Amino acid sequence: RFNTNDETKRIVWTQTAGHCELCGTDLTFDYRAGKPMKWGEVAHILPASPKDTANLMLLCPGCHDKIDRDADGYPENDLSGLHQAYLERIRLAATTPDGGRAIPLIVQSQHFQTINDIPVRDLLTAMSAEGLTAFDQGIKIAFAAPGPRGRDTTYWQNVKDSVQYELEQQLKRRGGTYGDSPALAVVGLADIPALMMLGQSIGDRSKRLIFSFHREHLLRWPDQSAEPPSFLFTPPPNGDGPLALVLSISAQVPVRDVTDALPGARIAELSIPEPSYAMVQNRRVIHAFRDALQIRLSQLEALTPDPIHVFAAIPAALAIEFGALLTTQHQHTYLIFDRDKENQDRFTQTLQLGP
Amino acid sequence: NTNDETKRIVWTQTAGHCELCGTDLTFDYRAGKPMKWGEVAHILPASPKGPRGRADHDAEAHTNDTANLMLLCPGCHDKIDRDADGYPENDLSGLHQAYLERIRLAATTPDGGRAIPLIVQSQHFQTINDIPVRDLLTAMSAEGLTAFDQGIKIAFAAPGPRGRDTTYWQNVKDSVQYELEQQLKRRGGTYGDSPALAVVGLADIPALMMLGQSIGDRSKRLIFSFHREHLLRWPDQSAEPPSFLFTPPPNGDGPLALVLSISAQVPVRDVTDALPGARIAELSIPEPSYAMVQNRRVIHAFRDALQIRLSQLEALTPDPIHVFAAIPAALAIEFGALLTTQHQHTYLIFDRDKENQDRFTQTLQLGP
Amino acid sequence: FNTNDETKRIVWTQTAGHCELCGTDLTFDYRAGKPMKWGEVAHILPASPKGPRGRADHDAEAHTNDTANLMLLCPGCHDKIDRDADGYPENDLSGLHQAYLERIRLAATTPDGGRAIPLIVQSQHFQTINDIPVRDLLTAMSAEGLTAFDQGIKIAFAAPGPRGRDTTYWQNVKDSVQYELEQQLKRRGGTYGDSPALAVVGLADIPALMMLGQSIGDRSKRLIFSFHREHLLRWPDQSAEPPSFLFTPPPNGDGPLALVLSISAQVPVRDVTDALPGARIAELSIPEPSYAMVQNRRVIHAFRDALQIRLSQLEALTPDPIHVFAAIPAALAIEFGALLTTQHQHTYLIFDRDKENQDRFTQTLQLGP
Amino acid sequence: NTNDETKRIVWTQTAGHCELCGTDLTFDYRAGKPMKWGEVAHILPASPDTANLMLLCPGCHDKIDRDADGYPENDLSGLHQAYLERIRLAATTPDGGRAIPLIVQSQHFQTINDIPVRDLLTAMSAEGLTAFDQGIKIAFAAPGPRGRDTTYWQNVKDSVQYELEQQLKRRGGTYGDSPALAVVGLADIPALMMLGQSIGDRSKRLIFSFHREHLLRWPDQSAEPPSFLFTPPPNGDGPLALVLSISAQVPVRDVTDALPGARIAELSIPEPSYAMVQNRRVIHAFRDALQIRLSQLEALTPDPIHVFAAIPAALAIEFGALLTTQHQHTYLIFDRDKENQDRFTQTLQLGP
Ligand SMILES: Nc1ncnc2c1ncn2[C@@H]1O[C@@H]2COP(=O)(O)O[C@@H]3[C@H](O)[C@@H](COP(=O)(O)O[C@H]2[C@H]1O)O[C@H]3n1cnc2c(N)ncnc21
Ligand SMILES: Nc1ncnc2c1ncn2[C@@H]1O[C@@H]2COP(=O)(O)O[C@@H]3[C@H](O)[C@@H](COP(=O)(O)O[C@H]2[C@H]1O)O[C@H]3n1cnc2c(N)ncnc21
Ligand SMILES: Nc1ncnc2c1ncn2[C@@H]1O[C@@H]2COP(=O)(O)O[C@@H]3[C@H](O)[C@@H](COP(=O)(O)O[C@H]2[C@H]1O)O[C@H]3n1cnc2c(N)ncnc21
Ligand SMILES: Nc1ncnc2c1ncn2[C@@H]1O[C@@H]2COP(=O)(O)O[C@@H]3[C@H](O)[C@@H](COP(=O)(O)O[C@H]2[C@H]1O)O[C@H]3n1cnc2c(N)ncnc21
Ligand SMILES: [Mg+2]
Ligand SMILES: [Mg+2]
Ligand SMILES: [Mg+2]
Ligand SMILES: [Mg+2]
Ligand SMILES: [Mg+2]
Ligand SMILES: [Mg+2]
Ligand SMILES: [Mg+2]
Ligand SMILES: [Zn+2]
Ligand SMILES: [Zn+2]
Ligand SMILES: [Zn+2]
Ligand SMILES: [Zn+2]
């Protein structure tokens, strides 16, 4: 055998997480089975190379005899390559909480910042529950109020440059074990058009987790277990009319309201069986919505080079993912219609994406 | 109180790190002394009036229950006990058990050899484009792949005021053919003669194809994929690859166009616009979807299908094959990997132009 | 032997509520977002002589409430110093304790000098790591009463390609200075106002830093900072008298007019005529050219005054462009460019050392109107 | 109109000074008097949440709040937020100490004088430099059958830089800054110069020097740098040799031997001593003097400068780091080959 002190044993036992390094057997199995843990009988510590605690291995008796066949406490072959690889896999898992370094971001409309102001703590506790760890004050920004020219292209561009400014400064704050940028923990509560621009700013090609505000559960997921709802599709009819995509997710949009604001519209509908305002039970719902949506958008874009007119009844989190989805190099024109308080809540064009 | 054996088990099963922040609790790196500075923290306290305390909780049973004990750094332990509402019982247990299983799965992962991590990302998007290093190494570790270092991470210079111009593609070419070769060379001694490359890319489709052609020879290439939902984790190891449907090109003369409707459906009208009179051959899947990269098998299926169709098309035209691709990043790399030596025909890669109303424009010519 | 509550409250007050050894905020939990006091008032010299750093000569009772013996530390830094007394000796902890409290005292007593946009511009044309720390720039600004709403802009030119600093390379520099920087200043626009001041530090290609200075020369409120091989972003000596700048006029003739700047080092005349045969050489120099000559911003101002009028004279002696062969610090390369921001600007051709041409001065960038 | 937590927060976030004048409002405690936190200071909103509350002294309070309504007449939000930003910057400074320990050595000095990482880490720790992972302890590779040719030295550089760059990727701190580099070297001078060639001098890098007695700790941090005396070279057509008599007086006879006809310019100190590196500023002092003279010598001739240095190890690394600019002048480094009675011999070429 190989002589070792108690500290050296406790170091080896700890760095290896109590598993044999060659076969992976959990050497703490006896304690788990209610038996006394004989640390010295259930495992042998020896050097990883023939002949520091960093070069000592933890082996089950069965594997020790296999690699130390002369019973001289030293391996016959140089097992340092496998040994270091083992410790590295353990180190990576043990440090995994480092990957939770995240940036809180709460984007609200001035209306909701005065009605349902989201406190940063509500997002931080929801983040903490999922292993997302903030390290500084969260970003809390409100969409600027539109001026005389309304929410023209300049307005929407300044909103994008503002959000991208705020997130780019914090994303520079790299850390962890590999210098990665922190994750973005983002929640939005604003009109659908503004939340789409929030998605346009953040994209979907970075470690970012969308959170959803709920009247009762706050930003905690009402049911991480719920199965995402089916996203059913109704294809558009034959014709030359303007192509309209109706999203009936939060509520069933009356197709009559869509053709009233867009006469002759060719209506394509993406819905869930029973629309409900709280249908965002967990983040997997948001992902499922994206997948189903992009599949249909590819089908609709193939049906026309003309703009796709969107009439959406979707929760806030889905409005963001929608916007984020449309951040590829490819860009098709989408004309976002929203119920306009200035026109009796009738659908009117609010935002144009892409060319 | 927790006995010594149970505390030793807590230290062992956690690998001596803080379960909430991941700090190494077995060593002081500032002064370099090995020391124990972690604390075995109780989720549910002994006294019902302690942090997370409850009336009918049996403090005698859970005093030595490993499901109730966490290895925490001194600071994290202070925080969870001084904000019991911010760190509720359910929150801690879920993270607690997730942390243990992550370690246990690493300990029981068979060694899969060494590989050089390679992240290649661009900046032609109007949003942040950043692939986390840890996620690639985690994905690798799940396959028994370890690295002597965190590997290579190349970011293409962003497009200048003129969009993706000649200067831009010159930089992309320099990044793939000079920067990468130089960083791989400097890793020559550490990784060996023919080391495996664990590659993940999220960059221009024409660029990823150039990357593939450059690494297409590097024996043992492990293409990983960035997924909008699962990031670097494979969405489904058990998912069966889809059918790669092919449409033969129309007989006659005209530029032979190769359209790939994989992540989405490429409207034919966009191809003929940038290449009129084109003879189009489409490789597609029944349901084009950004999310279709469920496992490396799907990538293996695409190369096998594409390999055949490239052979057919390459023997149907003398002139170049004009490519109009809507394909995931992982498959765009595998496209180029087939053009390294198994398909030495000239290929003209087109791509969407933000400065020309989304029209297709010629980008890189990939061939001998 | 116990620290009373008044003293512990002083310790928390004088440290700004942060750990003196790792700098974490001990007044707040950022993960869950609850204001909480998770710091500990640690004792450098312990009460018991057997404690970490214990001494028999130390009168425990006398210094139980002595701020000089009491450090606010996070719980982890406290365990480490007490579990490795050999590695954290009392004189090192005392020295760090005083350094930390003095830096707080200096911040609290700095008069408010306004806001400024931190701007870092660095290249990658060197064969070593070139990285200006962000904290060091912000700390130099704060030392001058300048604060910022964010950590500012940091632009890192693309590394040269396989062909060295080729045409593609200098195009990227142009795009980095004229497009990337302008785009990030526009995006900061609003937060900082209409005409915000720029706290700019550079360590990049001499021609690139001049083009930078030219771009930012119009935008007033320019505060140049300097990376120093010894003092980093801190000015070496605010009280140092700027050096005198000697101007050698050019000889009369029809040859190309060359401006030679010998400030960081003496530019050998043979190198200027090697690259520009028959050059009429005018020189601005300091008595002892040195890499470390930028002792304070007044040095940069002296270089401006010493040269502003001389550029007017030289432009009158030739209609052709002026060829610049400069061995100057990064901060002065930016100031030079800022001088080239006049109406009907005379053209300047910047030469630079060329690693591809055995260190010969090669023509790089042209700077004009 | 504030609670005791809000006051404790305002007092802790302002470090206990008035935000307008900067007086230490804890002065009464310093004078041995009980602290009347409520009588020595005023907490008042910054404009006509704790983030928008100011700590002021009574005198400064009576000036801004003249109408006694409890609010300022003018908006002091700009000054107040600037003050908190400055305090925050100072308090987080220990976070700017993230460093990478690098101990580069030759197998000879490694076997004869292995420098332990502990000794580097404790010296770093005293200067506020805090390592976050295992230190990098390297040994210069052994030469092949071609010796230490240009290939060997390019592998040395590529090896150091690859490992250095892998740890600099581990950004951190408050602004994502790359960690500082804490480096000590104990190897032959040419190898130490190539170490400097690798790290450069344009990044947060702090050299440490192994001292015979004081180890990796500085002998005297108050010691003023020595005067670096320069002897101009003789006029002639011979080879220009630069002799550095810093740790010892180089015998010109040994320079003439290795270089017949050498024109010797010398940089030395009044009393060459192996212990002259009393602190880092001595190294900075050596660089400045050296560069001022190298500029002078380079202007004399385009011919290569032959270096015969008797210098401490830390200075050898700084010399190598100094010659990392775009500009490059050929420098031929001569070391003593122990296989020739310690006769000087060219071992390394730095230049274009
Ligand atoms: N035919 C039709 N019938 C009914 N509504 C229809 C419609 N056609 C379109 N709509 C609109 O679709 C969205 C449904 O409401 P929602 O709550 O499910 O989603 C909203 C939305 O994403 C965004 C902007 O709200 P608004 O502009 O009112 O848009 C509304 C509604 O007008 O904020 C979300 N939001 C509001 N309050 C919230 C809260 N308390 N908690 C969480 N999210 C909340
Ligand atoms: N008619 C058409 N419809 C839709 N797209 C069309 C098209 N005609 C061409 N295209 C292009 O096909 C690619 C589809 O997107 P994708 O994600 O499936 O594949 C991309 C690609 O491989 C590479 C460069 O991106 P891009 O230049 O946008 O190429 C896009 C798009 O422009 O990065 C991948 N990528 C982007 N964002 C990602 C993310 N968030 N996560 C993981 N991978 C991501
Ligand atoms: N005959 C000659 N002799 C000496 N130099 C000569 C020459 N002929 C030309 N030159 C050039 O004069 C500049 C002197 O160096 P400097 O530091 O005083 O100024 C530089 C410059 O302003 C800019 C780009 O550097 P570079 O391209 O190397 O220009 C070098 C050098 O090539 O960055 C500055 N810079 C570099 N490294 C730095 C550091 N570590 N810390 C702070 N600032 C640093
Ligand atoms: N005429 C002449 N007279 C005296 N020396 C002369 C000479 N002509 C050349 N030389 C050489 O100049 C260098 C001065 O020695 P130094 O110790 O002051 O600095 C050395 C050097 O930087 C590097 C390589 O050492 P070496 O190869 O012996 O080169 C020696 C010596 O041979 O290691 C440093 N180093 C060695 N041991 C050390 C220790 N114990 N503590 C701290 N630093 C130590
Ligand atoms: Mg059991
Ligand atoms: Mg054996
Ligand atoms: Mg506890
Ligand atoms: Mg505690
Ligand atoms: Mg203590
Ligand atoms: Mg403790
Ligand atoms: Mg008042
Ligand atoms: Zn085993
Ligand atoms: Zn922790
Ligand atoms: Zn601390
Ligand atoms: Zn005052």
HEC string of B64-82 equals CCCCCEEEECHHHHHHHHH
In this structure, which residues have their CB less than 5 angstroms from ion ligand 10? C 79
> Which 3 state secondary structure label does DSSP give A103?
strand
Q: Which of B314, B250, B259 is nearest to B284 (CA)?
A: B259
Angle between helices D117-126 and C90-108 (to 10 degrees): 40
> Could you tell me which residues are beta bridge partners of residue C247?
C284
* Phi/psi at A152 (5° precision): -75, -170
Distance (Å) from the C-alpha of residue C295 to the closest C-alpha of chain B?
Answer: 33
Strands A243-248 and A266-271: parallel
Q: State how far the Cα of D67 lies from the Cα of D72, in Å rounded to an integer.
A: 9
| Ranges of H-type helices in C242-343 | 269-275, 297-316, 330-339
Residue entry with tokens 């028999």: C56
Contacts of C59 (CB under 8 A, 6+ apart): none
CB-neighbour burial class of residue A51 (10 A; exposed 0-12, middle 13-18, buried 19+): exposed
Residue B15 structure tokens: 């690998």
* First and final C-alpha spacing in chain B: 73
Contacts of A136 (CB under 8 A, 6+ apart): A103, A170, A173, C30, D174
Residue A120 structure tokens: 């940063």
Residue D203 structure tokens: 């990044």
Q: Which of B364, B322, B90, B63 is nearest to B208 (CA)?
A: B364
Residue A129 structure tokens: 């529950």
CA of B129 to the centre of ligand 2 (A): 12
Q: Is D118 on the interface with A (CB under 8 A)?
A: no
C-alpha pair distances (Å), B215 with each of B187, B335, C52, D152: 15, 11, 57, 28
User: Tell me, what amino acid is at A95?
Assistant: T
Choose from C3, C10, C18, C203 for mutation: most chain D CBs within 10 A: C18
> Which 3 state secondary structure label does DSSP give C367?
strand
Ligand nearest the Cα atom of residue D23: 15
Report the residue count for chain A.
355
Q: State how far the Cα of D345 lies from the Cα of B223, in Å rounded to an integer.
A: 51
Residue entry with tokens 């960083």: B183
* Phi/psi at C35 (5° precision): -65, 120
Read off the DSSP letter of residue A262.
S
Report the residue count for chain D.
352
Q: What angle do CA A245, A248, A251 make, to 5 degrees?
A: 145
Q: Which of C221, C232, C218 is nearest to C198 (CA)?
A: C221
* Phi/psi at C276 (5° precision): -145, 75
User: Tell me, what amino acid is at D19?
Assistant: E
Q: Which of D285, D275, D329, D326 is nearest to D307 (CA)?
A: D329
DSSP C81-117: HHH-TTTS-HHHHHHHHHHHHHHHHHHHTSPP--B-E
CB count within 10 Å of CB B350 equals 24
Do the Cβ atoms of A174 and D176 come within 8 Å? yes
Residue A296 structure tokens: 């249909």
Q: State how far the Cα of A236 lies from the Cα of A219, in Å rounded to an integer.
A: 36
Strands A346-353 and A334-340: antiparallel
Are D252 and D243 within 8 A, CB to CB? yes
Q: Is D118 on the interface with B (CB under 8 A)?
A: yes
> Could you tell me which residues are beta bridge partners of residue A309?
A244, A335
Q: Please, what are the domains in chain D?
A: 4-91 (no CATH), 96-217 (3.40.50), 221-352 (3.40.50)
Residue C127 structure tokens: 């064969």
Ligand 2 close to Cβ of residue B228 (< 6 A):
yes
Strand runs (DSSP E) across D167-237, as ranges?
180-186, 205-208, 229-231
Q: State how far the Cα of B18 lies from the Cα of B99, in Å rounded to an integer.
A: 10
Are C279 and C351 within 8 A, CB to CB? no
Are A271 and A265 within 8 A, CB to CB? no
CB count within 10 Å of CB C222 equals 18
Q: State how far the Cα of B120 lies from the Cα of B223, in Å rounded to an integer.
A: 12
* Phi/psi at C169 (5° precision): -60, -50
Residues 298-327 of A with CB under 8 A from B: 298-299, 301-302, 305, 324-325, 327
- Site residues for ligand 4, CB cut-off 6 Å: D 186, 188-189, 192, 210, 212, 247-248, 250-251, 274, 310-313, 316, 336
Residue A251 structure tokens: 């509520």
If phi > 0 it is left, if psi is from -120 to 50 it is alpha, else beta; for residue A23 that is alpha
CA of C77 to the centre of ligand 9 (A): 9
Q: Which of A159, C183, C125, A162 is nearest to B159 (CA)?
A: C183
Q: State how far the Cα of B65 lies from the Cα of B9, in Å rounded to an integer.
A: 11
Do the Cβ atoms of A207 and B265 come within 8 Å? no
> Which 3 state secondary structure label does DSSP give C366?
strand
Distance (Å) from the C-alpha of residue C344 to the closest C-alpha of chain D?
Answer: 32
Q: Is D175 on the interface with A (CB under 8 A)?
A: yes
CB-neighbour burial class of residue A125 (10 A; exposed 0-12, middle 13-18, buried 19+): buried
> Could you tell me which residues are beta bridge partners of residue B321?
B256, B347
Binding-site positions of A for Zn(2+): 20, 23, 60, 63
Q: State how far the Cα of A44 lies from the Cα of A57, in Å rounded to an integer.
A: 8
Are A280 and A218 within 8 A, CB to CB? no
User: Tell me, what amino acid is at C168?
Assistant: T
Q: State how far the Cα of C204 lies from the Cα of C328, in Å rounded to an integer.
A: 12
Q: State how far the Cα of C145 lies from the Cα of D86, in Å rounded to an integer.
A: 8
CA of B81 to the centre of ligand 7 (A): 6
Are D215 and D135 within 8 A, CB to CB? no
Instruction: Report the Cα A44 to chain-centroid distance in Å.
Output: 43
CA-derived radius of gyration, chain B: 26
Are D267 and D246 within 8 A, CB to CB? yes
Q: State how far the Cα of C129 lies from the Cα of D200, in Å rounded to an integer.
A: 7
Binding-site positions of C: 19, 22, 31, 40, 74, 77-79, 82, 84, 86, 88, 90
Q: Which of B256, B260, B261, B262 is nearest to B275 (CA)?
A: B256
Q: What is the largest CA-CA distance in chain A?
A: 89
SS3 for B35-58 is CCCCEEEECCCCCCCCCCCCCCCC
* Phi/psi at D350 (5° precision): -115, 125
Q: Which of B141, B17, B144 is nearest to B76 (CA)?
A: B17
C-alpha pair distances (Å), B284 with each of B172, B335, C278, C290: 28, 14, 68, 66
Contact residues, chain D, for C126 at CB < 8 Å: 200, 202, 324-326
The resolution in Å comes to: 2.1
DSSP C197-234: -EEEEEES-HHHHHHHHHHHHHSS-EEEE--BTTTBTS
Distance (Å) from the C-alpha of residue B181 to the closest C-alpha of chain C?
Answer: 11
Q: Whose CA is nearest to atom 26 of ligand 4?
A: D188
Are B293 and B233 within 8 A, CB to CB? no
Q: State how far the Cα of B329 lies from the Cα of D63, in Å rounded to an integer.
A: 65
H-helix or E-strand spanning residue D294: helix D280-300
Q: State how far the Cα of B326 lies from the Cα of A302, in Å rounded to an integer.
A: 13
Contacts of B274 (CB under 8 A, 6+ apart): B324, B350, B359, B360, B361, B362
Q: What are all long-range contacts of B171-175, with beta carbons under 8 Å and residues at least 24 apart?
A: B171/C158, B171/C161, B171/C168, B171/C172, B172/B122, B172/B204, B172/B206, B172/B207, B172/B210, B172/B364, B173/B210, B173/B364, B174/C161, B174/C162, B174/C168
Ligand nearest the Cα atom of residue D317: 4
Q: What angle do CA D85, D90, D96 make, to 5 degrees?
A: 115
Q: Given B30, B158, B171, which is nearest C80 (Cβ)?
A: B30
DSSP D45-111: ES---GGGEEEE-HHHHHHH-SS-SSS-SS--HHHHHHHHHHHHHHHTGGGGGEEEEEEEE-HHHHH
Q: State how far the Cα of A208 lies from the Cα of A324, in Å rounded to an integer.
A: 11
Q: Whose CA is nearest to atom 8 of ligand 2?
A: B326
User: Tell me, what amino acid is at C149?
Assistant: F
Q: Which residue of A has its CA nearest to D92?
A: A136
Are B137 and B222 within 8 A, CB to CB? no
Are A347 and A311 within 8 A, CB to CB? yes
Angle between helices B89-107 and A80-94 (to 10 degrees): 170
Atom of ligand 2 nearest to the CA of B124: 27
Contact residues, chain A, for B226 at CB < 8 Å: 205
Are D194 and D153 within 8 A, CB to CB? yes
Given CA atoms A140, A146, A147, A149 in this order, what sign does their dihedral have?
positive
Strands A308-313 and A243-248: parallel
**Which chains have at least 3 CB atom pairs separated by less than 8 Å from chain A?**
B, C, D
Are B329 and B232 within 8 A, CB to CB? no
Q: State how far the Cα of A25 lies from the Cα of A60, in Å rounded to an integer.
A: 7
> Could you tell me which residues are beta bridge partners of residue A19?
A26
Q: State how far the Cα of C204 lies from the Cα of D316, in Å rounded to an integer.
A: 25
If phi > 0 it is left, if psi is from -120 to 50 it is alpha, else beta; for residue A186 that is beta
* Phi/psi at A201 (5° precision): -80, -40
Q: Is C22 on the interface with D (CB under 8 A)?
A: yes
Q: What is the largest CA-CA distance in chain C?
A: 87
C-alpha pair distances (Å), D312 with each of C255, C292, D248, D276: 49, 22, 9, 8
**Quick one: chain D helix, strand, coil %, rounded to 5?**
40, 20, 40
Do the Cβ atoms of D169 and A179 come within 8 Å? yes
Q: State how far the Cα of D98 lies from the Cα of D95, in Å rounded to an integer.
A: 6
Are B111 and A82 within 8 A, CB to CB? yes
Are A187 and A212 within 8 A, CB to CB? yes
Residue C240 structure tokens: 């140092």
Contact residues, chain B, for C33 at CB < 8 Å: 86
Instruction: Report the Cα D268 to chain-centroid distance in Å.
Output: 23
Do the Cβ atoms of A174 and D174 come within 8 Å? no
Angle between helices C181-188 and A153-171 (to 10 degrees): 100
Residue C120 structure tokens: 């870092």
Q: Which residue of D has its CA nearest to A172?
A: D176
Contacts of D97 (CB under 8 A, 6+ apart): D128, D129, D130, D180
Instruction: Report the Cα B111 to chain-centroid distance in Å.
Output: 20
User: Tell me, what amino acid is at A26?
Assistant: D
Q: State how far the Cα of B362 lies from the Cα of B352, in Å rounded to an integer.
A: 9
Q: Which of C90, C82, C86, C96 is nearest to C40 (CA)?
A: C82
Q: State how far the Cα of C22 lies from the Cα of C96, in Å rounded to an integer.
A: 11
Q: Given D169, D170, D176, which is nearest A172 (Cβ)?
A: D176
Angle between helices C5-14 and D4-13 (to 10 degrees): 50
Distance (Å) from the C-alpha of residue B24 to the closest C-alpha of chain A?
Answer: 8
Distance (Å) from the C-alpha of residue C331 to the closest C-alpha of chain D?
Answer: 14
Contact residues, chain C, for B36 at CB < 8 Å: 83
Contacts of A246 (CB under 8 A, 6+ apart): A253, A255, A258, A267, A268, A269, A270, A271, A311, A312
Residue A236 structure tokens: 């558009």
H-helix or E-strand spanning residue B323: strand B321-326
Are A314 and A249 within 8 A, CB to CB? yes
Q: State how far the Cα of C337 lies from the Cα of C315, in Å rounded to an integer.
A: 15
Q: Whose CA is nearest to atom 28 of ligand 1?
A: A191
Contact residues, chain A, for D51 at CB < 8 Å: none
Residue A221 structure tokens: 């997921």
Q: State how far the Cα of A12 lies from the Cα of A4, in Å rounded to an integer.
A: 10
Q: State how far the Cα of D347 lies from the Cα of D335, in Å rounded to an integer.
A: 6
- Site residues for ligand 1, CB cut-off 6 Å: A 116, 189, 191-192, 213, 215, 250-251, 253-254, 277, 313-316, 319, 339
Atom of ligand 2 nearest to the CA of A203: 40
Q: Is A28 on the interface with B (CB under 8 A)?
A: yes
> Could you tell me which residues are beta bridge partners of residue A336?
A310, A351
Report the residue count for chain B.
368
Q: State how far the Cα of A327 lies from the Cα of A206, in Å rounded to an integer.
A: 12
* Breaks in chain B listed by the residue before each, with C–N > 2.5 Å: none
Residue entry with tokens 């930078």: C212
> Could you tell me which residues are beta bridge partners of residue D227?
none
CA of B248 to the centre of ligand 11 (A): 83
User: Tell me, what amino acid is at D231?
Assistant: T
Residue entry with tokens 């053919």: B177
Binding-site positions of C for Zn(2+): 19, 22, 74, 77
Do the Cβ atoms of B127 and A179 come within 8 Å? no
Strands B245-247 and B256-261: unpaired
Are A354 and A328 within 8 A, CB to CB? no
| Ranges of H-type helices in chain A | 6-15, 29-32, 61-67, 80-94, 112-115, 120-129, 153-171, 192-202, 255-261, 283-301, 316-325
> Could you tell me which residues are beta bridge partners of residue B280?
B257
Are B262 and B302 within 8 A, CB to CB? yes
Ligand 2 close to Cβ of residue B326 (< 6 A):
yes
Q: Which of D281, D308, D130 is nearest to D218 (CA)?
A: D281
Q: Which residue of A has its CA nearest to B360?
A: A330
Residue A38 structure tokens: 């004989």
